From a paper:
[name] from the marine pennate diatom [name] ([name]) plays a key role in sustaining growth in iron-limited ocean environments. Typically formed from 24 subunits arranged as a symmetric, hollow sphere, ferritins take up soluble Fe2+ and catalyze its oxidation, with the resulting Fe3+ being stored as an oxy-hydroxide mineral in its central cavity. The di-iron catalytic ferroxidase center of [name] (sites A and B) has a nearby third iron site (site C) in an arrangement typically observed in prokaryotic ferritins. Here we demonstrate that Glu-44, a site C ligand, and Glu-130, a residue that bridges iron bound at sites B and C, limit the rate of post-oxidation reorganization of iron coordination and the rate at which Fe3+ exits the ferroxidase center for storage within the mineral core.
Numbering used by the authors:
A (entry chain H), B (entry chain C), C (entry chain A), E (entry chain F): 2 to 158
D (entry chain B): 2 to 159
F (entry chain E): 1 to 158
Amino acid sequence: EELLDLFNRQVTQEFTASQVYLSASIWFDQNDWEGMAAYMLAESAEEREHGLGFVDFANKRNIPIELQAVPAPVSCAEWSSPEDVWQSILELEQANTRSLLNLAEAASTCHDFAVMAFLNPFHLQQVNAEDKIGSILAKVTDENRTPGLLRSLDVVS
Amino acid sequence: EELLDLFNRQVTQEFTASQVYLSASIWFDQNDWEGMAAYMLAESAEEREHGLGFVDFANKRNIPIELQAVPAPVSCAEWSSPEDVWQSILELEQANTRSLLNLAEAASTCHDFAVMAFLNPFHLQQVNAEDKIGSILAKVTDENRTPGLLRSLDVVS
Amino acid sequence: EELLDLFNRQVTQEFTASQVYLSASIWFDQNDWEGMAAYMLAESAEEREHGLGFVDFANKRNIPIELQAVPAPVSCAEWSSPEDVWQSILELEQANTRSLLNLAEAASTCHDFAVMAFLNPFHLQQVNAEDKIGSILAKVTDENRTPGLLRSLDVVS
Amino acid sequence: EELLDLFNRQVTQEFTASQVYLSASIWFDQNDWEGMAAYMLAESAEEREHGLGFVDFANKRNIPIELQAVPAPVSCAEWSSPEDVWQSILELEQANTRSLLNLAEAASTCHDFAVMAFLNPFHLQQVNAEDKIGSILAKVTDENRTPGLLRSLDVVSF
Amino acid sequence: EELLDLFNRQVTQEFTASQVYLSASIWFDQNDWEGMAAYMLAESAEEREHGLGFVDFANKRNIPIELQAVPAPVSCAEWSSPEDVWQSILELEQANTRSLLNLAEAASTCHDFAVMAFLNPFHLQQVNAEDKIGSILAKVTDENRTPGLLRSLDVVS
Amino acid sequence: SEELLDLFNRQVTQEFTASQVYLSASIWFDQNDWEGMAAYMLAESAEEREHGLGFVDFANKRNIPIELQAVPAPVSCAEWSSPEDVWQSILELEQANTRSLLNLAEAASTCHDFAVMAFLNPFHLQQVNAEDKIGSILAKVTDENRTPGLLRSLDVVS
Ligand SMILES: [Fe+3]
Ligand SMILES: [Fe+3]
Ligand SMILES: [Fe+3]
Ligand SMILES: [Fe+3]
Ligand SMILES: [Fe+3]
Ligand SMILES: [Fe+3]
Ligand SMILES: [Fe+3]
Ligand SMILES: [Fe+3]
Ligand SMILES: [Fe+3]
Ligand SMILES: [Fe+3]
Ligand SMILES: [Fe+3]
Ligand SMILES: [Fe+3]
Ligand SMILES: [Fe+3]
Ligand SMILES: [Fe+3]
Ligand SMILES: [Fe+3]
Ligand SMILES: [Fe+3]
Ligand SMILES: [Fe+3]
Ligand SMILES: [Fe+3]
Ligand SMILES: [Fe+3]
Ligand SMILES: [Fe+3]
Ligand SMILES: [Fe+3]
Ligand SMILES: [Fe+3]
Ligand SMILES: [Fe+3]
Ligand SMILES: [Fe+3]
Ligand SMILES: [Fe+3]
Ligand SMILES: [Fe+3]
Ligand SMILES: [Fe+3]
């Protein structure tokens, strides 16, 4: 019952992303990027709400949910500049997107029209999230070419 | 530094309790106790906010946080009735209280007045939380003596 | 009483900090850093308000206060750029913190519960104050790596 | 004066009632009947207000008031269900009614028209108070026949 | 244990003070000091509210409370002037302060952080209460040096 | 101008000195339970500090280098034992704030420093107001304090 397992794992993936955003928030705060830290913190809350959405839909559709361990974030070990963090967040969102497309591909195989309809807005959110992060990362990578300049973006924007 | 250690453990414990309250709402939902499930769901969010509060203080005080795995909730698999769930949630809160007091003990021994001040409203919150859950459990245990009657409590949320 | 002595020293320490913030405001103003000047000026009034809070408590609790001289700020003479100012201010705040922690320890030993309670919000204020000065100093030190760029933090504030 | 004496005893009886209501609040609360607890709590403040009213009238009328001890409520030692509590509260109000009629009898005897006029709203309050408490007791006694049912109306109601 | 006892005594002391304040309102009213009487009456209600706050906390923390007798006030038999009343009220509050501090000592000894946190605002209120009473008494004692002058305090504040 | 810069610096010192003397006075009044008088001195302390900040602000704009001096420990408190003594000391403080403004203005006139003279003018008028008001309070205090308790009644009302 691959579909029920993938749905279950999607919840884990959402909560996993929430923790990694939190991890990014903490690294930014510890290094005095309060603007970038606030953005990561909001995204952490948003990834948790996506998870809660999946759980609620599962409850309604009698998809048994069993909550799994939420793994320790580990990219924070290696981050040493804002660019490192944003790049890890971009990889996280790309993985998020692949996991949703797998889910929707299993639903399609099983003719599970309800699940596919449920997933639609999420596919469009991922498009927007990858673009947004991609854009932030491009800015960060450009600005960090001059010492101190990126520190101006955080504060202003 | 056992203080740093206990502070990290507290963050973990708050997120752990968040997940346990989510598993409770899941079980309540799946068994058609929507009122009780709404309540657990809001407590889940609240525990997460307590975790965030600790993280924020730790950042400001240069207590380095490293996010740990959030363990899977274990007790659901054994719950059979609402009484079982409210009992596990009472134990959870009793544990929550214990670890706040341990943390506070270690702060005291260190003369860390800032940490003690920070924890005061959580100590008072814990008193309230254990009271409220104790009270709910007593009602549940009294009302469940008549078949069907507890379902009536549940349509009071 | 050493408690009495320390309580009186704390008043002087708050007024001393007010003067030193004022000295910084002056140095910033004379050097055309109006945004940083305004910020230091507001911190000078706040420090004076803390002094006054201690004085008022002392009157109420029969701690005799005798006001001491407020020494001339000395660090201005050596400041050459905004980094030097902000680093002196961070030191000032670290010393404000230590003096409050010593007062609290003296209060603890005498079982002076009222003094300990009165001090709690100042312990938490200090945590915030050090985090905030720490974070400005980090930005200032990063942005001053490019000529003129820090002058852009000041105006955009 | 028997009147001065009864007037002072009236004050004591009110403050005693206030304490007994408070002990009922505490038993309810400790036993997780928060609605019944809130009711008793509000009744304790009301009884205190009746005592203060008597005190104020006494001062105006030059009846010297000497505040007496308010004894420890002791029935809580033996309460074990809400029914026991409300039974004790009914007895309490029947006693409040009796000390009021004693005071009024003595006032009538002495032709103290002012005192009797002062007492009239209290005589009507007691009527209402005894009626309300008796009705709550009848409800509690009927509901407690089915396990759990009483609890379900502490919550919904009070 | 010492904590449950002291906690019960504290409720007793608050209700006793409530009666003592009532007793003073009585004495003032009987002697045509309506202003001072109204003030004592408000204080009587306020002490009663403190007692109820302790009771509520004890309920929540499972500190069994059993209400003790409220003794007959007895200072009233000896009061001859406003000054004697206000002197008894000062001693009353100094005794209120004493017992709070003992309760706090005992809580500290047991590491009862919740009780200590609950007590902190009462410690600060006692400081204010003793100040205010000390100050009223100074005024009464000064003003009563000229016949009839104290009747002025009363009809104004 | 050298004596003009020095006097302008001393003027800053004088305002903050006065601010601390007024605070000393608030503390003495509070400790002796004159709350009304205490609140008035505290308000004055803040206002004196504001005047100082106004001088600092003008100095900065005019490029008069300000170096902040020690603010001395107030010492009149040691001597005060009634409200009269506190108010007299405050009158003499405002009389010295006045002399010191007039000195400054004298140096500026000499130097033809028109902007400084313009800047001082409202402070000259304020000092008139301040010496008049302290004078009036001190006369009231000294009159009232001839009857025991009387002064106390008017801290409390006014
Ligand atoms: Fe978003
Ligand atoms: Fe997501
Ligand atoms: Fe997003
Ligand atoms: Fe986003
Ligand atoms: Fe928690
Ligand atoms: Fe909790
Ligand atoms: Fe909760
Ligand atoms: Fe809550
Ligand atoms: Fe601030
Ligand atoms: Fe600040
Ligand atoms: Fe400070
Ligand atoms: Fe600050
Ligand atoms: Fe009633
Ligand atoms: Fe009623
Ligand atoms: Fe009623
Ligand atoms: Fe009554
Ligand atoms: Fe009654
Ligand atoms: Fe009070
Ligand atoms: Fe009060
Ligand atoms: Fe008061
Ligand atoms: Fe009290
Ligand atoms: Fe009191
Ligand atoms: Fe003035
Ligand atoms: Fe001035
Ligand atoms: Fe002046
Ligand atoms: Fe003035
Ligand atoms: Fe003025």
